[PDB]
């Protein structure tokens, strides 16, 4: 009668950067299924009545103006280059303002995001590569120069920023139902 480890995901003291978003695989357990809460392809009042093959718990941090991108069929720097959800996504997205946890007076430059990438991310793709991005014709060869920039930047979360620039911790729960046996049942 194992209980699903949701406490470890929502109540984690430190969250991952959006470009290196974390995923917790949850299986073979019983779950008791100012917050941004949007579900897609499935109703929340029905999750306690459904069993799934696997439930994937994706967690990361973005800024407030970027939470609208964590959704199916969305475009933008976060959706295309950091964390993409498929068009037929079945699950829920949860976000809450974490300005009291992830913002420092001198600036919390620890949280990063990808700015440049040659192509768009596939659904659920995680790219932690930090190779010098070639924006021109000449080969960069790991040289930060003209048309050769570093692909990651910092959020620099400060408490004096506006809500659109304040940190938001995001937890994306994917509900998978392939073949296999259904082990994650709500109760």
């Amino acid at each position, epitope marked *: 009668t194992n209980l699903c480890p949701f406490d470890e995901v929502f109540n984690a003291t430190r969250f991952a950067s959006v470009y290196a978003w974390n995923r917790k695989r949850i299986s073979n357990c019983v779950a008791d299924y100012f917050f941004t809460f949007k579900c897609y392809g499935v109703s929340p009042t029905k999750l306690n009545d459904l069993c799934f093959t696997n439930v994937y718990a994706d967690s990361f941090v973005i800024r407030g103006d970027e939470v609208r991108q964590i959704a199916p069929g969305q475009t933008g720097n976060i959706a295309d280059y950091n964390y993409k959800l498929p068009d037929d996504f079945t699950g829920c997205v949860i976000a809450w303002n974490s300005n009291k946890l992830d913002s420092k007076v001198s600036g919390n430059y620890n949280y990063l995001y990808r*700015l440049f990438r040659k192509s768009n991310l596939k659904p659920f793709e995680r790219d932690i590569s930090t190779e010098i991005y070639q*924006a*021109g*014709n*000449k080969p960069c060869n790991g040289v930060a*120069g*003209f*048309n050769c*920039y570093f692909p990651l930047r910092s959020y620099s979360f400060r408490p004096t920023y506006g809500v659109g620039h304040q940190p938001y911790r995001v937890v994306v729960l994917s509900f998978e139902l392939l073949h296999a046996p259904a082990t994650v049942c709500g109760k």
Partner: antibody, heavy 123, light 109 residues
Framework: EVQLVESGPEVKKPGTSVKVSCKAS????????MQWVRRARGQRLEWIGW????????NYAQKFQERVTITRDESTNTGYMELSSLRSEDTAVYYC????????????????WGQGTMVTVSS | AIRMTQSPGTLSLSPGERATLSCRAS???????LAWYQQKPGQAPRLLIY???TRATGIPDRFSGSGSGTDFILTINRLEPEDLAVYYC?????????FGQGTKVDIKR
């Protein structure tokens, strides 16, 4: 039309500040680096600084490090170059250059040039 | 700071002759980061050659770039009267992206 259009001529008292505009058209401006160059009347070109695409990360020559600030506004598709503590020797035609880009690819050199902004410092 | 020295300061050639312009750096610069520009009277500079030997878009084939390391060359095979201008070279692989003093091309007569 791939264009770079700078602001109009200026007259600035010695010790004041001038901020030259450089608005883009035709190409993806957010993908485009930008360098600033000036030329005094009948002299050679003088490199001021450049800024990387996407961020505000700028780089300046030592001569203008203290008083030149190169910025860019992604929403209005315009880059700026502000020169404080103006003096007589700053009278010159100031240019902005950039490589043209689409959404993903860019040119390997600066082929797009503004028409130039003539700034004159006098009392 | 890399110093760029162009020579001669002024070149007076008959139309149809071949022009030859020198650009020399105080140290080796990467060929892909050496550019040539052309600035005509009352006009902004125009990119002619980048990557030492790659003609920019729209640049006629009579313009030619060559060289490496510390000695780069611009060649105008058949000079036309419209080619009168000041020609600058620039290295932009090492900050500061210094310019040369330019070479002025007059039409012989």
């Amino acid at each position: 039309e791939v264009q770079l259009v700078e602001s109009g001529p200026e007259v600035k008292k010695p010790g004041t500040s001038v901020k030259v505009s450089c608005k883009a058209s035709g190409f993806s401006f957010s993908m485009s680096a930008m360098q600033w160059v000036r030329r005094a009347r009948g002299q050679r070109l003088e490199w001021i600084g450049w800024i990387v695409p996407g961020s505000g990360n700028a780089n300046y020559a030592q001569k203008f490090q203290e008083r030149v600030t190169i910025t860019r506004d992604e929403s209005t598709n315009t880059g700026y170059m502000e020169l404080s503590s103006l003096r007589s020797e700053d009278t010159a035609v100031y240019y902005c250059a950039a490589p043209h880009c689409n959404k993903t690819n860019c040119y390997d050199a600066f082929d797009i040039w503004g028409q130039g902004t003539m700034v004159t410092v006098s009392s | 700071a890399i110093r760029m020295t162009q020579s001669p300061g002024t070149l007076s050639l008959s139309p149809g002759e071949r022009a030859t312009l020198s650009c020399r750096a105080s140290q080796s610069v990467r060929s892909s980061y050496l550019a040539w520009y052309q600035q005509k009277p009352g006009q902004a500079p125009r990119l002619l050659i980048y990557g030492a030997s790659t003609r920019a878009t729209g640049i006629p084939d009579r313009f030619s770039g060559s060289g490496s390391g510390t000695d780069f060359i611009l060649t105008i095979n058949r000079l036309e009267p419209e080619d009168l201008a000041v020609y600058y070279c620039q290295q932009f692989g090492s900050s500061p992206w210094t310019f040369g003093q330019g070479t002025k091309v007059d039409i012989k007569r």
